[PDB]
Curated annotation (Swiss-Prot):
HAMAP family: ENDOLYSIN_T4
Name of the molecule in the record: Endolysin
GO cellular component, as recorded: host cell cytoplasm
Lineage: Viruses, Duplodnaviria, Heunggongvirae, Uroviricota, Caudoviricetes
Catalysed reaction, written as an equation: Hydrolysis of (1->4)-beta-linkages between N-acetylmuramic acid and N-acetyl-D-glucosamine residues in a peptidoglycan and between N-acetyl-D-glucosamine residues in chitodextrins
Matches recorded under CDD domains: T4-like_lys
Gene label: E
Length: 164
């Protein structure tokens, strides 16, 4: 397991535009297209990101290329965010993927908003972190995925993902 494989499982893979949980137009492996509620706007953003007349449809390779850009972006976000960095730094490699996973999913700001949970993470207070993470809109929104994430933070292993 690694963050790519992990995110691959959490985001899945779609070759056509779709909407994410918050209703945003997305495509591929969780590639958010735009925050405009306009599909047309989305198709336009898609052709721009792909640099082709896509027609709302991409190829797998196309999805992976966006995915790479996106993981990189999530990594930069964790490494560059004042709040996040210190925590990232204190984590083992496994819990580091979990954290990147969250940033990928909801952006650095969102993640930074889990004030206490991140605090507990930095301090290795695993169960306390888990409990606080579980008390959230994030958790309610995408419970299945939040649950795996939290298990990782809780256990520090890939148990939640490895037999998927």
């Amino acid at each position: 397991m690694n963050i790519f494989e992990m995110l691959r499982i959490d985001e899945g893979l779609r070759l056509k535009i779709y909407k994410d949980t918050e209703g945003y137009y997305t495509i591929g492996i969780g590639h958010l297209l735009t925050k405009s509620p306009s599909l047309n706007a989305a198709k336009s953003e898609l052709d721009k990101a792909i640099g082709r007349n896509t027609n709302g449809v991409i190829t797998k390779d196309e999805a992976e290329k966006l995915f790479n850009q996106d993981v990189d972006a999530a990594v930069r976000a964790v490494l560059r965010n004042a709040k996040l960095k210190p925590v990232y730094d204190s984590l083992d490699a496994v819990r580091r993927a979990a954290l990147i996973n969250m940033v990928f999913q909801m952006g650095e700001t969102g993640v930074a908003g889990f004030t206490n949970s991140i605090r507990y993470l930095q301090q290795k207070r695993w169960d306390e972190a888990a409990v606080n993470f579980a008390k959230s809109r994030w958790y309610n929104q995408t419970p299945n995925r939040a649950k795996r994430i939290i298990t990782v933070f809780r256990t520090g292993t890939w148990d939640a993902y490895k037999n998927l």
